[PDB]
Amino acid sequence: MMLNEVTAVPGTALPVAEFRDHLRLGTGFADLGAEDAALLSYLRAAIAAIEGRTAKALISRGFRLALTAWRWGDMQTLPIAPVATVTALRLVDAAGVETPVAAGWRLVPDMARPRIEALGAMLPMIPTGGRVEIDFTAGFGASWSALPVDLAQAVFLLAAQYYELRHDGAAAMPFGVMALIERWRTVRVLGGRP
């Protein structure tokens, strides 16, 4: 299960022009001077901190989930939560014949537990040694405006914090960064065999 991203964000999809406004608009020094491409490097650091704590995706990037054995008999919960439209469930063998499948499975979308959940009880078996591989597109929307705005504010509360102070310096807000994230974290209570 490597789960590398196929493509990253373009960078032009990120709200750098809007984050300059969350940094100092309506109150402030002026527009002031901010290294523009620096401000893009703190948004990518705040999204990747909230993509990890929430297990969401937020920009709808393309993924590739290549894992060896199916965990359940049929279920296969996908980790990156807001999903849409499996690109392909191609199945490579130990030599690399890469024979895709086009039926036998129906992705059941959900923000809680996205699944693969094949038809009946038969999910495509794995060639011995030949890892299965699932390409999917997971996230809310293509642009920044399609996001839930409370989750978008948790990026701006966090990316501004990485802008305002560089090293790990000390400094309880009601809806802080942490309180806006907790309704998007994954609540799991299984430590068991299934």
């Binding site: 100092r24 020094f29 305002e164």
Partner: protein, 110 residues
């Protein structure tokens, strides 16, 4: 962080120049700000021939870029009714830059 409670009518004078080089002030009103007014230690001060009564009055408003209407320049004065607060300087009180300290007098002749 400051609790803003007073309504101060900000006032800026247009400078109609006279023939000798001296401008004539009008003190036309500008839009109203909200502010807190914190007093200082006050005592009466010898004017020209007037025993003027002054108090320091650090006034705190919100901020703006320097080329905006909402910044009190030290050209301008505040006025709450008939109590004119001159502006000595503006000094950007907050660390993040949200609030501006002003500095006043309230010189009543007394």
């Amino acid at each position: 962080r400051p609790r803003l409670n007073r309504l101060l009518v900000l006032e800026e004078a247009v400078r109609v120049a006279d023939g000798a080089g001296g401008h004539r002030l009008d003190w036309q009103a500008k839009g109203e700000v909200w502010a807190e007014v914190t007093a200082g230690s006050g005592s009466e001060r010898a004017g020209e021939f007037v025993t003027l009564a002054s108090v320091p009055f650090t006034i705190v408003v919100r901020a703006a870029p320097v080329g905006a209407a909402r910044r009190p320049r030290p050209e301008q004065r505040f006025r709450e009714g008939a109590r004119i607060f001159r502006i000595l300087a503006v000094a950007e009180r907050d660390r993040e830059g949200h609030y501006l300290s002003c500095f006043a007098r309230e010189e009543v002749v007394a």
